[PDB]
Design a protein around this motif. Sequence first.
Motif, PDB file in Angstrom:
ATOM      1  N   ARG A  45      58.218  62.003 130.795  1.00  0.00           N
ATOM      2  CA  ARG A  45      58.401  61.044 131.866  1.00  0.00           C
ATOM      3  C   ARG A  45      58.677  61.799 133.130  1.00  0.00           C
ATOM      4  O   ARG A  45      58.474  61.277 134.233  1.00  0.00           O
ATOM      5  N   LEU A  46      59.155  63.031 132.966  1.00  0.00           N
ATOM      6  CA  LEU A  46      59.557  63.862 134.093  1.00  0.00           C
ATOM      7  C   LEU A  46      58.802  65.199 134.058  1.00  0.00           C
ATOM      8  O   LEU A  46      59.355  66.212 133.663  1.00  0.00           O
ATOM      9  N   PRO A  47      57.524  65.195 134.496  1.00  0.00           N
ATOM     10  CA  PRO A  47      56.674  66.390 134.380  1.00  0.00           C
ATOM     11  C   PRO A  47      57.145  67.594 135.209  1.00  0.00           C
ATOM     12  O   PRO A  47      56.554  68.671 135.100  1.00  0.00           O
ATOM     13  N   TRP A  48      58.188  67.434 136.028  1.00  0.00           N
ATOM     14  CA  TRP A  48      58.761  68.610 136.697  1.00  0.00           C
ATOM     15  C   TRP A  48      59.807  69.327 135.842  1.00  0.00           C
ATOM     16  O   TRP A  48      60.405  70.324 136.271  1.00  0.00           O
ATOM     17  N   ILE A  49      60.029  68.835 134.626  1.00  0.00           N
ATOM     18  CA  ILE A  49      60.969  69.473 133.723  1.00  0.00           C
ATOM     19  C   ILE A  49      60.274  70.564 132.923  1.00  0.00           C
ATOM     20  O   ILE A  49      59.272  70.327 132.257  1.00  0.00           O
TER      21      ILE A  49
END
Length: 203
Positions: A45-49
Motif C-alpha cells: 500500500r506504501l510503495p515508498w517502503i
Amino acid sequence: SKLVLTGERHYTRNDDIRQSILALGEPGTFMTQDVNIIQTQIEQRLPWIKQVSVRKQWPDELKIHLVEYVPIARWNDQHMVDAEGNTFSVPPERTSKQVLPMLYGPEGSANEVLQGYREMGQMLAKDRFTLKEAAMTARRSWQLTLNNDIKLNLGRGDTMKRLARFVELYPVLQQQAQTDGKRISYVDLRYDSGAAVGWAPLP
C-alpha cells in the motif's frame, strides 16, 4: 493493545499505517492479526517502503519498524530512484518541493542510467555545470539538460570523450553568445568530426 511505530519517516504519514491494519479487520482485534499479512499490506500500500518489520512484543505491543527508500533522482517521470538503483514511487502531493535531477530511461535501465549520471555528473561539476536531467534511449543514446536550459545531445558513441571536449570548448562559445546578447541553448556533439550549436535570446 498498542502500536509502536519506529524508523525514519519522510513520506509515511500516520494514517498510512492506520489504514493498512484496518484493511485487515475490525479495530480492537488488530492485536490478533497475522504479522506477516500486516507486513504484506504495508509493503503493497506504501510503495515508498523499502523494508518493514512487524512483530508482537510483550506486553501487548505491535512493533512496526519502517525503512523508506531515499530518492536521489526522479525516474521517468512519476517514479523515483535511490542510490542503489532501486525504483519506487510516492504520491505527487507528498513531494512537490524537492529539487531532484530527472533521469529518463527504458524500463529496467534505472541503474545503468544512474551510473552514467554519476560519471557524467562528476566530470561536469569539476567545472560548474549542474547536471539537471539525463535521458538515455533504448539504443544507448544520451541527452543532457545542464544548469540553464542547455540541451546537450551527446549521442550513442563514446560519450565521455565528447563530454570532455564540450567542457574544454564551452567557455569560448559562452563568451561569444554573451558579447552578442544570446545564450547557448543546444549543443550537438552527437558525431565524430562535427558539432552543431544553437542559440536563443537571453532573459
